[PDB]
């Protein structure tokens, strides 16, 4: 029943891609892994190669989505930032009051597209100065930060917390707890 769009670009952090996809699917969310560049395999930042479910061009026609998820990885986030297609998807998502979730350097694509200004956000530590250029957001060092419909997180090591937050936001606390327990987190 809820639907998630995960935008996958070359150079994405494969942990930050895979952990949310897996955990969201455990939550009974219908997840589309959409390739920014098309339907071909995507080479991620540590050379794992992921085959997307669809091109972004195709997946964009199958909305709307309850959440649009942006993984991190500096070079994947740069590709997200440079994409007019991403700009349109994120502007439409904000316009319809839909959740936007971004992790590690992924939030700097929000800055690039002028999304969610005035929100409290976090990033990877090393992405803080990029994110804060212009003072358009307030910074947080929380591992996961949720300010209304903008949900941000810090790094590979926060990816389970990030995914569980998405699941809580969409499907509620009880489902997030049920999904958590078999994972052997703590």
UniProtKB/Swiss-Prot annotation:
Where in this protein does the record say N6-acetyllysine is found?
A: 146
* Root EC class: hydrolase
**Expression triggers:** By hydrogen peroxide and UV irradiation. In pancreatic islets, expression increases under hyperglycemic conditions. Expression is also induced by sulforaphane, an isothiocyanate obtained from cruciferous vegetables.
What does the record say mutating residue 164 to P does? In PARK7; strongly decreases enzymatic activity; reduces protein stability and leads to increased degradation; ubiquitinated by PRKN leading to its recognition by HDAC6 and targeting to aggresome where is degraded; interferes with homodimerization; abolishes interaction with PIAS2; reduced localization in lipid rafts; almost abolished detoxification activity on methylglyocal-adducted CoA
Outcome, altering residue 104 to D: Abolishes oxidation and association with mitochondria. No effect on chaperone activity
Q: Report the outcome of residue 177 to T.
A: No effect on detoxification activity on methylglyocal-adducted CoA
Q: Which family does the entry's similarity section mention? A: Belongs to the peptidase C56 family.
Q: What is this protein called?
A: Parkinson disease protein 7
Which species is the source of this protein?
A: Homo sapiens
């Amino acid at each position: 029943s809820k639907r998630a769009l995960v935008i996958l670009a070359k150079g994405a952090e494969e942990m930050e891609t895979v952990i949310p996809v897996d955990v969201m699917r455990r939550a009974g969310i219908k997840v589309t892994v959409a390739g920014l560049a098309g339907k071909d395999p995507v080479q991620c930042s540590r050379d794992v190669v992921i085959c997307p479910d669809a091109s972004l061009e195709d997946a964009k026609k199958e909305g709307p989505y309850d959440v649009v998820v942006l993984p991190g990885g500096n070079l994947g986030a740069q590709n997200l930032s440079e994409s007019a297609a991403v700009k349109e998807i994120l502007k439409e998502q904000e316009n319809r009051k839909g959740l936007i979730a971004a992790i590690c350097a992924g939030p700097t694509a929000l800055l690039a597209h002028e999304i969610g200004f005035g929100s409290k956000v976090t990033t990877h530590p090393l992405a803080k100065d990029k994110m804060m250029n212009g003072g358009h957001y307030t910074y947080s060092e929380n591992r996961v930060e949720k300010d209304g419909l903008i949900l941000t997180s810090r790094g590979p090591g926060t990816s389970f917390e990030f995914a569980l937050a998405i699941v809580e936001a969409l499907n509620g606390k009880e489902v997030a707890a049920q999904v958590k327990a078999p994972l052997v987190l703590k």
